[PDB]
Structures are given as structure tokens and as C-alpha cells.
Symmetry: D3
């Protein structure tokens, strides 16, 4: 067999495929957010009995999509400064909020960390505590989250997740020790696709950290790789042979490329050139359309792990320099 | 690597592991069926335009779990006889009702065939048209159907599927040309596990055809094989390390072995001794506890395909002799 | 690894590679057929005791290559019409005629169905009952049928199969209830390659159904995919490093592309764009050279399963419309 | 997945499963050999132009099964001794006689080497030049040689190979520089199963070298491993679900374990305890029933490669001691 | 294929296979430690520039095997307490000390953390900075560390690693804020096997954390699994067919089962019943022979990940109770 | 999955990628060889008691890199001619000199054969007896030999191997029955890469046999294939994300393409076009830059086995014609 390869790096850097979105993309999202804003946010922070000594940990509950109650953690490092910067952290596919001690990186660097639990997931590599609540009937689907409600953008799973995620920034901003001028939205892989949505839809985010982003350039992802989770879509289309146009129409409303074209905040991206889960052409498509000030860290030899702890160093340096003005 | 192997056949034939079920197993199912019976069945058969010439095809809708509307097909062979025997057909994992022409076997053999669509699935190997409707919140789960609602038997996905399947036999029986003395429940793999449940829960079924059954002896299945779909449960338990006792309690209410101990109608089973999706020990555990008159066809060299078209011949000969 | 991909669709639709055949291609086939016609067809249809109720089943025996007796099934739906249309069904690799109840589709749609057993196979996924009878010595070969007798077109396995298949249509035509104006030849995968040969060699076929055809564009197939059964040819060539020119000369006489260029009857093809057993470039090469009226159904997300039950629907609609003209 | 393991070594050393053969096993082989002996052997040795300098190479042709003409190589080391000992070398599955320079080991150790080409193979890992000639119709079969004619011992492929192989020893013995008191029959894997047959059927062989033998204890092999080529039999049985008894009856006539029970010449065996192509329980079954003086070299950590060049050293030493 | 399974749990709980060690096992280790103690430990702690805010990070250097200079990190949480408890952390196969921010768990829980870099590794999943120094010639070996110097225990790779690890505890104990009554040795997988050796050889360790231990019951490991790294041994033995007795003789001196029989400090073990890297029978053999006060957490459905974050919670609670006395 | 494919043959035939070497490449090698030449070669040939009858077998010892003692075999066929031609044979990755009877081909063809043992390997498919002796510290590395000392060309493993190999030709030339006008350097795979280095560095070699060469065009190899052993370099780079430039700078001094540009003796190459261990583009890059008289045998359907026994025949014929003048 042939080892994975995408477009050459010189082509990746110029890759700007034709965008496809419906004319009501913005109106869809405006209505979605307006509907959810009719419910009070009702943020709840409850301090936990914990063995943690350098951080205070809080159980979080807030109202996400249509008032539905989403879990999280808030880790506050024990420091003298009265207002601290904050990272809102979104989680990779099949993960959930786990335990507070699973998210010590940002607090150790002096940042408040808001970890948003992902509705209905939390059963693959880290446990979760938040259910999904569907729009009535749960249509035929392929196992997983990628095709859950895919026949209509109004019923699609990521409509609810992205709305949760925009509301999570509001919930973080409500914590009294959070410096609202230094709120960062962050994620890798599904988390990066969520953060990319939030960068276009939120008014409160001040910077984006976007690693090896998933949920980008769907039509290309499906043709390029046979890995999960993009293969969920392919397997659905293999069966539902009459639904191709509808499937990609729905997905157009949730595509990171279309959000990137609307985002204005400063962003640090990362990409692995041998990543066969989130292919480099899908990541570069999103990066290249990203409309805010931007940088990308390129890891030529890395698969889905990306830059690992090297990239974490880059992120801390990037934010320090940004927030010095 | 090591080739798949289960217990030797001589051990499989005596394999009767200790059963685990809760005290309220029967009460759970009695309440479930009573609550769904409060909605009218409202079976609808709508003759469709079709290119089929030897068969009349109907679009089916009936009320399953809690009045929720389930799709299916009814295929009636064009024959002179006024009352015909009927097979109620349940579908394998990730399948759905597909097209009428996907179910030509039983009609061709002179049987009315009622194909029940599987709620929420239909996206893997044959398309489906029936949604699931959850009991409120859809809890954290691993991709698929095996762990959907698994923390409480009341919320568990197969509660709804098994209720649909019991109601499907009532729907079939309400068709005027069906001979109610010759209603057969049939399935292979997930369909076999569904049919095994129906064999204990239904009052209308007269015979069971149970091929290579899934949804049997969960605790053993999860230790034995790393194949999907049983690995969905294993993967959930890898993450939710605190939920093991709860998971297996819930599953006990849906285990084919526990239904088999309650079933009284005549049954023909099949098993593939090299089946690593539905291991022979889980299938023999169910067969060995099956409380009605029973036979099993054993296919020593077959994987999940079982007896294939050979077993289809065994089934037709079995039912002919039974109903004489 | 890399996920399978062939030429882009826009290139596939224009793909007309240079054809290679010997100057005696037609003479080879004329002599082959003339030599087999010297034996009487002697078609025998024997009614069977069956549990089937909507269809009458017949055990079939007829003379194929050089008078050799080939088995089949004939399924006749119980309908009032005195002359019925007929599908001659060829079978995929490692399959055979199985049981009569394995072929209920076409009879259920009102067609007589003649299923031809495949000589010497019948041991992979459906049982068969017909032997092969070689031209004397059985030369060194790689396991399978693809290299059986490959050093000479006169000894090659598919010379015998394709002659059996041309005689199968004569056998079907001899059944009294068959409408000879509505004889269809049909197959998928090896069956599709057999059917493609018959479309060029038979005088009795009126329409072709050709799904995901095997036995097409061998030189491309062997360099594109490492899957069986094309890999049998590759494996033979890895060992018999002196026989490359002879192997591809022999295969030129049996290539679906060379038959397609001679076929004049109306045809419906199908192709799976992710099919790595019968690659889309080999299928499109045959489709593009096909010299009769033609259509193709394209399944972008399907592998070797092709259009499945969706394509069955297309085939029934195609034939209904054709035979109403 | 799980890593391959067979019976523990202590159990392997005592493993003597019940043997199955038909009452006419000996008569079947007596009648097969007598029929082929009615054609003259007509051994032809044709010196070749070669770049080889330490060895003389001959193109061999002789009559095997029913007078059919089998190819081979004869390699004679250029030594002063007027009569030399001889190794008759059988080849592994999908191999053939290749080139003369592929068989330099035994000649370099001072032995004449007769390499028998394998009918109809020669297309996997080493080229071959000898065709098969079937007993009329070539029945339905799974790809390969293991199920070619398997529905009748008289049509089965290995009937013709084993007969060739017995005649190969007669052909080698006819070469004037061969010392007939020091004729060795040798093989690994398919070669070893061939050699094991020849050790029971030939009158001319004086010693057996049998490495990691294939064609042994078929019923166990098929249940134990899913590797090729034993899997060819399994796959044929998955489809021809009515032919199980007939398949194993045929195979009984060709099983190394039944030949081993009849062999009287001295033998050196080898076995790899992690061999998942020729499992150690099938090899030990044949070794344990072997009726002549015998030794086995056991390689606990090796797969199908066995003892490799270490074993080759064992074989040279074994034969030197034996022929002193 | 067959999914991985070891002995049933009820058998695992009683599994005490016969131990094999040479008569000079203790003398070998006494001599090894005495020889390395002749070089000064010369521990160096160098406060480094870091973006970490809740922790003080130190570059560590100390003398391990025969005076050779080994790297590490020391992470000290910023807390008012003047003496703190300490975890000496050993690293999994193909890993190294990485960056200080890779080891935030224990400091966040109020423990000083001493992370020992692994000589010659650090190139698989986390970077390292410490070379190996062989005893003269580097004999023929299979790729990796398992068979490096395996023909003599005096030249074997893990002789040098285990001596470094015993000296790492002495280096940690020399830090003035370390409470010497609360020094813990900890590791998972290779780290667990190192920690197990240290639990027998060190005089300063007060508690052992030993997760999914590697380097245990080699003869069984090599029989049971075909995974790396145990398969490095098998692959060496496949080639060096004359060296079986020598290989297992050497390995006996480094076997966690033989150290466990000598260890007296309180321990918490963990085991995954589906672990095919470190099989449960090799782990239970070590646990069952462990001579100090002991508990084991059993994870029936987990592979080599073990208890993950659940086990981390178990470790924190275990130590808190132990050191309350 | 996608089956392996490299550039089309017509492109391979013209493939001359831009070469990268440091401006001290020649000076590095001149100094390396001069430093090793300060130690006496001290060749030792000791006749063995052997069961071989057509060949005399000698145990060889000679001084390779910096006086270090390297093992080998010398096989002398028993012929009347007083001086014989000689093949110096280098060995594939994870192999060693094995037993004398493993190398009977060249002696049987009337050539003396000098088999050089490969330092530190000999544990994968054929046993070896020669250790490595590192330049002091053995830095962090990935399992295997490709990354051993890779951070500095002075410490790199192949500096020592290539020096041994140049000295092996001198050792061979010292045997009294060797005709020094007919000394051939030969290898496949790692052996071919070693031989290619020797063809530029040795003054005594008269012809090169170079099959499916490894150690060629590293930057391309690492992008193209995910197979071992080239993946050892990729794996090292995935972790040491800061060391890319250094790694490829080191490797430039050991790249077969750069030696090929300097080699002047006649050469026979071979290449398998389906070889995914040594890709055809890396082999053709070296062949195309080869500066001496050259021929290549192309095996379009072979993987890493190349031309096998067919190529052995090509080699014997090639050398016969060459040495006839
Ligand atoms: Ca708009
Ligand atoms: Ca009760
Ligand atoms: Ca309708
Ligand atoms: Ca012509
Ligand atoms: Ca007898
Ligand atoms: Ca002692
Ligand atoms: Ca420092
Ligand atoms: Ca220079």
C-alpha cells in the first residue's frame, strides 16, 4: 500500500478552493443564536472538594442550545492577580470534560480555564456528563455524531454543539476573576472546528487557538481519507444514495471554511502534513480563508498528534506577545 | 495472530452458564408492553406502484413503542389461496427496510412477508426510513446503538426496538389474508436477537427462525471478541470505568438468553462455529436455555454468514413439516 | 495509508486509452465460435421439485465450449403472458449457480431468468456444479482462474467461459416461453466482463446490463490495484519475469475494452468511484469505447458493491423504457 | 488481537490423536504406483551450458504419474569420488525448480542434488516449468492446489504429485554417479509433506529430512489456523456445506500422519513452535506416529522459517553420522 | 482472528509461577550499586526560565550509573509549606523528560515532582536529552533497548537504567524542600518496571506507584504476546537460536518478579485485563510476589491505558491515607 | 487502501532531483578515511573446519573504522586457476555474516567471496558476530540503526559502516589468490547503499553490483513511504521537531545519490517498480546521477525482492562480458 500524502506544501499554501454556502448562511446562524438567547444563561459555578492544591476547581453548568444545561469545569490558578486571562477549551471527538486534573496546562501557565463538556459524547477516550437533546425524531444515521440529524441543518447535531460553544464564552466571561479583554477560544481536532465556528459567531472571544481542525472542507475530506470520523459521512452516503445533495447542503452551514471567511480575531493554527484524520488540504483551506490576523505552525512529519508539546509552547508565546499589545 | 476459536462443540452442546436477571424482569416487560398498548396500533397498508409482477407490495405504518410510527413493507405473493402463512422479518444491525424487492425470498415460497424497519438505523448496508424517538435526554454514548441509553433499562434503545417488534406481529396479524395460525417470527444476527425477544413477549407468533443471534450473553460476548458491534459496549466501559455494574444490569433485561428461558414456541436456530461477530458460546447459551421445541443447524466452517442459502432451504422444510 | 483514488471524474469521462489487440482478434473469436458450434447445443430443461410457489424452476444443461456440458437454472415466473422477456445472468468470481432461490429478482419482475453456472469455480461465496475441462496440460499458474492457461489465448480459461456464455444465450432462446425480441444479458463484476464479451460475440442478445465490470483494461488494473483477483496476474508476472509480453498479448483477446469497441446493442453500465477491485478507470475505458447506445450510473461513494438495490431499480426502469420503443 | 499458540510443548511431545484412514489406504497406493510403473521411467539427463564452475548442472526429465513428463535439475559437485551421496529435494508451495543456482547447498556439501519440479505450480516465489495433467474434468474448486480434485482421491492433485515424487527417487538412483546406499529424501513445508509420503511409498530412499511439514493432520490444521494454504480447504467447505465428509475422506489418503505410521527409514524432523502456517500440533502428530528411527529439532521462537541455516547444519551433521 | 485474553481473573489472583534467578542476584546488585556510589552524586538543580506560574521548574543533572550524567526536571509547586512530599517519576518506553509542562499532575496535587530522563531513548513519543554510554562494544542486537547488551547482565542496558533510577531518588532527597519521609517512586509500563526495581534497591523510597508494569516475567511475556517491545526479545531469539539460555539468564537479573519478592514498602498497583503490551499474568506475577503492604486496582475492560485518570485519583487518595500514618 | 505507486517509468528515467550536500562533503570523507588508515589493517584469515567440500571457508578479521575489529567470511572455490576474481559482499538491514554456507552463489560461479559482517546488527534475519563501537555517548535515538548518532555526521552509525566497507576491499585484496584487477563490490538493499558509498570512496573496486539500493535520497524516501527502516527517521523527526535541518544535513553525507555523482567504475543496477521499502524514485535518482558506465535492470511487477534469481543471472553475464574487456 501507499503512504498518506496530500497536496505538496507549496500548493497547500495557495489552496483556496471555491466555497459553497447557501444564501441564508448568516440568517440561519442569527436565528439560531437569537432563539437560544431567549433562555437565561444561568451560569452556575460550584467549588469542588478536590485534592488539587495550586488550582481551585469549579463544577460548571450553563444554558447552551435552547436553554439545555451543559456541564464543564473551571480551573482557577491560585495567584495574586485579581483578573486573569482565560482559555475556553473545546474537546476532541468522543471526549468529554473528564476530571478537573485532566486540564492543568492553561492554569499552570496562569490562565483561568473553562472546559466545555461535549453533549452526548464522552465515551471514547475521556468521560463526559452532558446529554444531547434532539429536535424530536432522531432520523436514521450511521453510528456516531457526524450524521446525526444530517438531513436538515435545523436538526443537525453540530447546530446544538456550536450554540453551546458560543454560550460557553458568555459563561466564562461571567466569572468575576476573568479578564474579558483576554478571553481565548481554543481547541484541537473537533475542538478546533468548534473554536473556528465560535471565532465567527461569538462577540466575546479575543484570540483563537486552532490545532489540526476537524469539520472543515467536508466534500474534499470525504474523497481524500477513509478514516473515521469523516468516513461516517461516506458510509451514510454509500447507503443513502439519493441524499448526496441534501447531505452536503446541510454540512455547508457547519463548515469551518465558511466560518473562517467571517472570523476577524487573531489566530494561531497548526497542521500536520501527514495527518490522515484531518487532512492538510482541509486545514489549509480553512487557514487560507481565515479573515483575521493569522499564523500557522507546520509540522511536516507529524500525523494527527500535530505539534504536541512543541505547539503548546508556541501557543503560550503567541498569547503573551498578543496581549502585550 | 491466532485464528478465532470458542469452546469445543462437545462443550458448546452442554454450555448452560448461570443466568443473571433482576427480580423485576417480567414486571419491566409487562409494564413496557401495557404502556405501549394504550396507543392504538393503527396499522396502515398502502398498495404501491411497483415493477414487481409476482408479488403485491404494501407500504406499512404501525404504532410501536409509545405510539411512535414505524415503517415496513408487506409483500404478498399473487396466489389463489385466500389465507396465507406469514413471516415477520427483523433486520440486521445498521440495516433498514430498503426496497420491497430486497425481501423476495419468503413471498416466492408462498408466504406473506412483513418486513419491520429498524428505528434510527438504516444507514450501513440497506437504507431505512424510521426515526428513533428518545426518552428525553440522549446520554453520553459510544458511536452506535448498543450503548444508546444504556445507563437505565427504561431509556435503553432496545426497549423501544423490542416493543416495536412485538407490535409488528400484531400489525401483520391484522392483514386480512394472513393465516394467524401460521405466523412466523424470523431474523438473523440483530434480527435473530429481536425475534428471540418477540418469542417470549408476543402472544401471536407461532414459530421462530433464529439465525446467528446477536444480543445474547453480553458479559461473555464482550470478553470473547473485539469485533463490532459488541465492542461498542467494551469501549464505553473502557471510558466509564465506574459504570460496569449499571451497564450489565441494564443489559440483563435485553439478553436473548433470558428471553429464551421464557419462550415456548417451536424454533429453528443456526450457528457458525467460526463466527467472531456473534460467538458460538453466546448463541448456544441462548439455544440451550430455549424452553420450546427446538432444533439447531451447526455450520462448523462458517463465519457470520452462517448457513447462507443452505439454511434458507432448512427453514422452508422446517416450517412445511411444522405446519402440516 | 492512503485511501483509494483513481482519475478525477472529469478525466474518467474522457478516458480513452490507446487500445491494444492483435491483428487476428476477430479471426480468433470466429474460429473459436465456429469450432464450438460443430457440437449440438442439446439444451435440456428439467423441471424440479421445489418449495417455490411463484416461480417454476428448471435444472438446465447445455453444450458450451467444444461440446462440454454446462449447468444452469431457468426460473419462470407464473404469469398469464405466453411469451416473456428473459435475462441471461452471469456470475461473479468464485461463485456458481447456487440454488434456484438465489436468483428471484428478475422472475419477480416478470422476466424469465437463465443463470449460467461458471466452469470450475463455485467454491468461494456460492456453490457451483460445473467442471472446467482444460486443453490438455494445465501449465504452471498462480492460484485462481486469472492465470489458468495464460501463456496462449487458445488455452486460456476465459476462452472457454466466454464461449459457454455465448451458447447460454442460444440455450435461453430455445426455451418456448422466451420472447426472443427481449433477451437481456446481465452481470456484475466477472459477470459484467463475461456479459461485455457476449455483447460483441452473440447475435441473439438485445440489451446489456453491465455493473462494475471485471476483465477490463488489464495493464492499467495491474498497475493500479493490489487487490484480488487482478493481483493474481501481478503475482504470476513477479515470478515469470520473462513472460510479460506473452501474458498481456494473451489477455488482449479477452479484454472488455476490445469487445466494447465491437458491441452494438443498447447498454446500461454502473461504476463505483471508490471501487478498488474493479477500478473506475478500467470500467470507464470499457464504457467510453462501447459502440452501442449507452448510459452509465455513477456511484461516487460506493466501492465494489456499486449501486446495489438502487441500481437494480435503474435496470428495471431502463429495460421497460427500451422495450416499449 | 491474540498472538498464535498451539498446545504446550509437554503436551505436543505426547500428542497422538486418533488416526483416520479408509480400509483401502494401502490398496489405493499399491494400485496407483503399479499403474504408473507400467509406463517406462525414461530418465533423461542433459548437461547444460552454465556459468557454474564447482558443479555440473543437468536438465532432468522423467515419467511421473501415468507417464507424464516431469522436469527437474541434477547438480553434481565436481569431486574426485566416483560414487556420491544424493539428496532428492522437494519444493514448497507455489514454487518450482527455478534455476540450477537456486539449489547449491547440498552440492557444496558434497551431495548430488536432484530437484523435482512441482506440477502446475511454479508461479509464487520460484518459477516452474512442469504442467499438471488432470484426470478429465477439473471440478469446481477454490483458488490453489489444496482443493483441486478433492471430491475423489483418484482425481486429487496430490495423488499425482506424490507419484511423481516416488518416481523422482527412481530417476535419481538411475544416475551412474549416485551411491544408492546414500539416497536422502528432503523437504520443508509442502516439500516435507511430499517427502513424508515418499518415505512410506518408496523402496529406494535411505533417510528422510522433514522440516516444518505441510499436508499433516488436516482436520486439526483447518480448525487451528486461518492462514493459507490450509484456509483453501476451509473456504471450499464454507461454500460446499454438503461435502464435509467426502473432503476429509479424500484428504485421509494424503495425510502425512498416515504415511508416517508406515515409514521405516531414519528421519530428522524440525518444528517451529510459533509456526501458524504448519502448526506444531500437526507436525508433532506426524513425528509422534513416525515409525522409523527419528529425531526432532524444536525451535520455540520461530514461525514458518523454522531453524533456517541452523537446521541446515543439523541436517549435514545428522547425515554424516548416519552414513558412517 | 481471536481477541486477546490471558488467564481468568480468579486464576490471575493466585498466579505465583516458579521464580528463576541466579545464586548471585543480590551480589550482582550490591556490586553494581557500590561501584556507582564511588562517583559523587553531584546533584545540580538549576532554576529555569519558564512561562509556568504555579510551579517552579528546575533543570536537573545528577550522576547515575558509573558517574554518567543524567538529566531531569524538578517541578516545585508554589505553596507555603516548607517541606513537601515528592514523587520520583520514571518514564515509559521510547519517552524522555520532554518539557517541564508535561509533568504538571503531581505538583498540582502539592507534590514536588522529580522526572528522570531515560538514557538513550526520548525519540518515540516524548523528547529526551540523556545519552546512553555502553560498556565498550555494542553487541549485535535487534532494534530497540530490550536486547541492547543482553548476552551479559554486566553489559545489559537496564543495568544502567536501574542504577540511574536508584540514584535519582538520592538526587531528589538532596533537594532542601523535599520531605524525606514522603518520597514516592512512581511509574507506568517501563516506568513501572523501573520503579519496581527501585523499590527493592533503594533505601530512601517510602511508597511505590506501579501501573501496568513492563519488564516482568519475561519468559511468559515472550510466549504470550507478539507486540513490541517484548517482541524485540522474541525476534533476537528467532535469529540467535543458540543464545536462548544466555538471554533468559541475563533477563532474570532485571525481572520485576524477582525485585518484587524483595520489596518492603507500601505499593499501589494497577492492571488492565485486556492489556496485550504488558499482559495481566506478567503484572499479577509481580504483584503476587510483592513482599510489602499492597493493593491492586483492576480494570477489566482496559488495554495498556489501564485506569487512566481514574487511577490517578486512586493514587492521590492512596498516598494521602498512607502518609496520614 | 491505495496500492503503492511512484513516478511513472518515463519520468523515473529522467528523474534528476537537485542534490544537496555540504561544501565539506569530500573533506569529511578524506579525513574519515585518513584517520582510519593510521591503524594497520591487520587482515587475518583462518581456515575453518567445515562440512563444505567444493569451497574452502575462512574466518576473517580486519580493522575497519578506527582500528575496530570487523568479522567476515572468505569463500574460496576449489579450482585450478591460481588467481580468481572476487566479490566483496555487503549485507542487508538487520543481517550479519551468518554461516559460510549462506553465501555459496559467487564461489559456485568461480569467484572468491568476501562477506563483510555489519557492525551491531545481525539479529533480524541472519546472525552476526560484530559489535558497534560508538563515538562516546550514544544519543537519544529511535529503535534501529538509521538514527544512531544522527545529530552529527562524525557520530553517525553509517560513518563507521562505510569506513569498514572501504577497508573490507583492502582486506579482500590482501588475500593471495585474489586477482586484484577483478574485484567486484556487491550488495542489495542496505548492501547496495554501502556498495554505492564504496564505489566513490575505494580505489581498489573494479565493478559495482547495486540492487534495490537503500540509503538513497532520504528526503524523498521519508515523504514517500511509511515502511521501515526509512520510517525510523520519520519517527525520530515526529518527536524531535526542532532537529529537522540537522537531521537532513547529517544524512546528506551518507546519501547514495551524492556518492553516485562521484563514482567512476562500471555498474549494474536493479530496481523493482513496486518496491515500497526502497522506492524506485530514490533508486533512479542514484542511478541517474551515477557517473561511471552503467546499466539498470527494471522489474516492473516486483516489490523489494527485485529481480531475484533472474538478476543473479544478469550479474554473472554482466561481469563475464566486462572482464573479457
Ligand atoms: Ca444572507
Ligand atoms: Ca418478578
Ligand atoms: Ca405511503
Ligand atoms: Ca483481423
Ligand atoms: Ca487395506
Ligand atoms: Ca546470593
Ligand atoms: Ca541547565
Ligand atoms: Ca569541498
Amino acid at each position: 500500500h501507499m503512504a498518506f500524502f496530500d497536496l505538496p506544501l507549496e500548493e497547500l499554501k495557495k489552496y483556496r478552493p471555491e466555497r459553497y454556502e447557501e444564501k441564508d448562511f448568516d440568517e440561519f446562524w442569527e436565528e439560531t443564536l437569537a432563539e437560544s438567547e431567549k433562555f437565561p444563561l444561568d451560569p452556575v459555578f460550584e467549588r469542588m472538594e478536590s485534592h488539587l492544591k495550586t488550582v481551585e476547581a469549579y463544577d460548571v453548568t450553563f444554558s447552551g442550545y435552547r436553554g439545555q444545561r451543559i456541564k464543564g469545569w473551571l480551573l482557577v490558578p491560585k495567584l495574586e492577580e485579581e483578573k486573569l486571562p482565560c482559555v475556553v477549551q473545546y474537546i476532541g471527538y468522543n471526549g468529554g470534560r473528564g476530571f478537573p486534573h485532566d486540564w492543568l496546562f492553561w492554569p499552570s501557565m496562569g490562565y483561568i480555564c473553562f472546559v466545555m463538556d461535549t453533549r452526548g459524547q464522552g465515551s471514547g477516550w475521556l468521560k463526559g456528563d452532558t446529554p444531547d437533546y434532539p429536535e424530536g425524531p432522531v432520523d436514521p444515521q450511521y453510528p456516531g455524531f457526524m450524521t446525526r440529524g444530517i438531513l436538515d441543518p435545523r436538526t443537525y447535531y453540530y447546530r446544538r454543539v456550536f450554540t453551546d460553544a458560543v454560550r460557553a464564552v458568555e459563561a466564562a466571561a461571567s466569572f468575576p476573576q476573568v479578564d474579558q479583554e483576554r478571553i481565548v477560544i481554543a481547541g484541537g481536532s473537533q475542538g478546533g472546528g468548534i473554536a473556528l465556528a465560535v471565532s465567527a459567531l461569538s462577540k466575546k472571544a479575543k484570540a483563537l487557538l486552532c490545532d489540526v481542525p476537524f469539520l472543515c472542507h467536508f466534500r474534499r475530506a470525504v474523497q481524500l481519507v477513509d478514516t473515521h470520523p469523516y468516513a461516517e459521512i461516506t458510509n451514510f452516503l454509500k447507503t443513502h444514495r439519493d441524499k448526496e445533495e441534501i447531505v452536503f447542503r446541510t454540512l455547508s452551514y457547519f463548515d469551518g471554511v465558511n466560518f473562517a471567511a467571517r472570523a476577524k480575531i487573531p489566530a494561531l493554527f497548526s497542521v500536520g502534513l501527514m495527518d490522515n484524520i484531518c487532512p492538510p488540504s482541509t486545514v489549509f483551506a480553512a487557514y487560507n480563508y481565515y479573515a483575521g490576523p493569522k499564523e500557522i505552525r507546520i509540522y511536516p512529519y507529524n500525523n494527527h498528534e500535530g505539534g504536541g508539546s512543541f505547539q503548546a509552547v508556541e501557543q503560550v508565546k503567541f498569547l503573551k506577545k498578543l496581549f502585550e499589545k
